[PDB]
Write a protein that binds this ligand. Structure first.
Ligand SMILES: OC[C@H]1O[C@H](O)[C@@H](O)[C@@H](O)[C@@H]1O
Ligand SMILES: OC[C@H]1O[C@H](O)[C@@H](O)[C@@H](O)[C@@H]1O
Ligand SMILES: [Ca+2]
Ligand SMILES: [Ca+2]
Length: 410
C-alpha cells in the first residue's frame, strides 16, 4: 500500500497527493481549454466524461479545501464553477442542452450550495454568488412547467421535452431538488424551501421509489405507465442523497418524522451498499466492464455526504464513521496501480487494483471517489455546514427569475 491514513497528518498528506492525481485529469485551467469540465463529452470523442461530472469534481474540491485547509486549487475551482453558470446564472448554459437534466443541473447547484455552506471564498462582486446560484437552480426546478400531473407530480429526468428520457420521472432528479430545498431551508431559514422538500420527499415515498418496507431506493419509472414500471436498480447515490437531504430536514425541523426517515434510510444503505464495511456499487460492480463513467463517481458522493450527515444528525455518527473508515481503508489499499505505484481503481471491496481501462475511461471518477473518501476521514475536525448566521455568501431574491430565463420560452 502506498497511501497511509492512520493519523491526521498521514490523511492530510494522502489527500494532498490524491488531489494532485485527480487534478492531472483536468485541463480546463490551461490555455485554450474550457474551465469547469473534465475531458469530453464522449459523444464528441473529446474524452470520457459529461458536463455534470465537472460539477461533481468542483464540489469534491470545495469539500477538499473545507476538510484539509489546503487552498491550493481554490482559484482553479472558482474559475470552473463560474464558467459554467450560463447567461442566466442558473447552471443552464445552452451549449449543453443535450446534457441538461435536472440531475446535471442539480449537481452544479449542489456544488454551489456546498460552497456557501463551506464558506468557500466568494466570487468577485460582479459575478454570481454561491448561495444565489443554488437558489437559481432550485427556483428553476420549482418552476410550474417542471411539475405536471403525470404520476401526480415529481420532476422528469430531463429538462427539454425533446430530450430522450423526458418520459422518465426518476429518483435522482427529485433527490437533487429535495436535497437543495432542504439545504436552502437550513441555510436561509426560509420555510418555503422546506415545504417543497417535504412535498418532493412525500412524492418519492408515495410513488414507491422509496420502498415502504425496506427503505431501498429504486431508480425511477415512466410517465406512460403512471410511474409503476419501477426500475429497481439501486444506485448508491440515490439512497445517500435522500439520506443527506433528510438529515438537513431533521436538523432544520427537529421533527421526529425526519429522524425516523434518516434512521430508516441509513439502515437500508448500510444493509445494501456496505459489504464487510466497504461501499459497493451493487447495480454494476459485481463484474468488471459494466459501470458507466457516471457510476464510477457515486461512492465518492456516498462518503462525502454520509460524513456530513454525522455533523448535522450527530446521533448517526457511530453508525457511519466506522464504516466510512473501513471503506476508505479498502479504497487506499487498491491505489497501487502502475505506472505510478499509486493509481486508483474502483473495485475496493475486491482488494485488488483493476485498471480503469476495463471500464473504458481514463480513471477520473475512481480518482475523485478516493479523494472524496480519504478527505472525508477528516470530518471530525471540520466545521459543520454554515447557515446564514455565519456564512459569507449572498443570495438573490430573483435567482432563476430573469426574463431571458429558459422557463420563459418553454
Ligand atoms: O446510464 C444508464 C442508466 O440510464 C438510466 C436508466 O435507464 C438506468 O437503468 C441505466 O442504468
Ligand atoms: O448513472 C445512473 C443514472 O443513469 C442515468 O442518469 C439515469 O438512469 C438515472 O436514473 C440513473 O440513476
Ligand atoms: Ca444528463
Ligand atoms: Ca472512453
Amino acid at each position: 500500500q502506498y497511501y497511509k491514513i492512520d493519523t491526521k497528518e498521514e490523511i492530510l498528506e494522502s489527500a494532498r497527493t490524491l488531489a494532485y492525481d485527480m487534478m492531472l485529469f483536468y485541463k480546463g485551467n490551461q490555455s485554450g481549454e474550457i474551465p469547469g469540465i473534465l475531458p469530453g463529452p464522449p459523444t464528441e470523442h473529446k474524452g470520457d466524461y459529461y458536463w455534470w461530472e465537472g460539477g461533481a469534481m468542483m464540489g469534491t474540491y470545495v469539500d477538499y479545501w473545507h476538510l484539509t485547509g489546503d487552498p491550493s486549487y481554490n482559484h482553479v475551482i472558482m474559475e470552473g464553477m463560474l464558467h459554467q453558470v450560463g447567461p442566466n446564472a442558473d447552471y443552464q448554459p445552452p451549449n449543453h442542452t443535450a446534457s441538461l437534466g435536472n440531475d446535471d443541473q442539480g449537481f452544479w447547484g449542489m456544488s454551489a450550495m456546498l460552497a456557501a455552506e463551506n464558506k468557500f471564498p466568494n466570487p468577485p462582486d460582479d459575478k454570481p454568488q454561491w448561495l444565489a446560484l443554488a437558489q437559481a437552480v432550485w427556483t428553476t426546478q420549482a418552476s410550474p412547467e417542471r411539475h405536471d400531473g403525470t404520476c401526480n407530480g415529481g420532476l422528469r429526468w430531463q429538462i427539454p421535452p425533446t430530450n430522450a428520457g423526458y418520459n422518465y420521472k426518476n429518483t435522482i432528479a427529485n433527490a437533487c431538488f429535495f436535497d437543495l430545498g432542504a439545504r436552502l431551508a437550513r441555510y436561509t431559514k426560509n420555510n418555503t424551501y422546506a415545504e417543497w422538500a417535504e412535498k418532493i420527499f412525500d412524492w418519492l415515498y408515495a410513488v414507491g421509489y422509496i420502498d415502504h418496507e425496506t427503505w431501498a431506493v429504486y431508480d425511477g419509472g415512466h410517465v406512460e405507465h403512471n410511474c409503476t414500471d419501477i426500475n429497481r436498480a439501486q444506485f448508491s447515490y440515490n439512497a445517500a442523497l435522500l439520506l443527506h437531504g433528510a438529515a438537513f430536514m431533521w436538523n432544520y425541523t427537529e421533527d421526529q418524522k425526519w429522524k425516523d426517515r434518516v434512521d430508516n434510510l441509513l439502515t437500508g444503505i448500510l444493509r445494501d451498499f456496505f459489504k464487510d464495511g466497504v461501499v459497493f456499487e451493487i447495480p454494476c460492480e459485481g463484474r468488471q466492464g459494466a459501470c458507466t463513467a457516471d457510476m464510477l463517481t457515486f461512492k465518492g458522493y456516498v462518503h462525502r455526504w454520509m460524513a456530513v450527515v454525522t455533523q448535522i444528525a450527530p446521533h448517526t455518527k457511530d453508525r457511519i464513521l466506522p464504516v466510512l473508515r473501513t471503506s476508505a481503508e479498502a479504497a487506499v489499499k487498491q491505489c497501487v496501480g502502475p505506472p505510478t505505484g499509486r493509481r486508483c481503481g474502483f473495485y475496493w471491496k475486491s482488494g485488488k487494483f483493476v485498471d480503469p481501462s476495463v471500464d473504458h475511461t481514463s480513471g477520473a471518477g475512481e480518482a475523485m471517489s478516493v479523494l472524496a473518501a480519504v478527505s472525508s476521514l477528516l470530518i471530525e475536525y471540520a466545521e459543520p455546514p454554515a447557515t446564514n448566521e455565519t456564512g459569507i455568501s449572498r443570495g438573490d431574491p430573483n435567482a432563476g427569475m430573469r426574463s431571458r430565463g429558459a422557463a420563459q420560452h418553454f
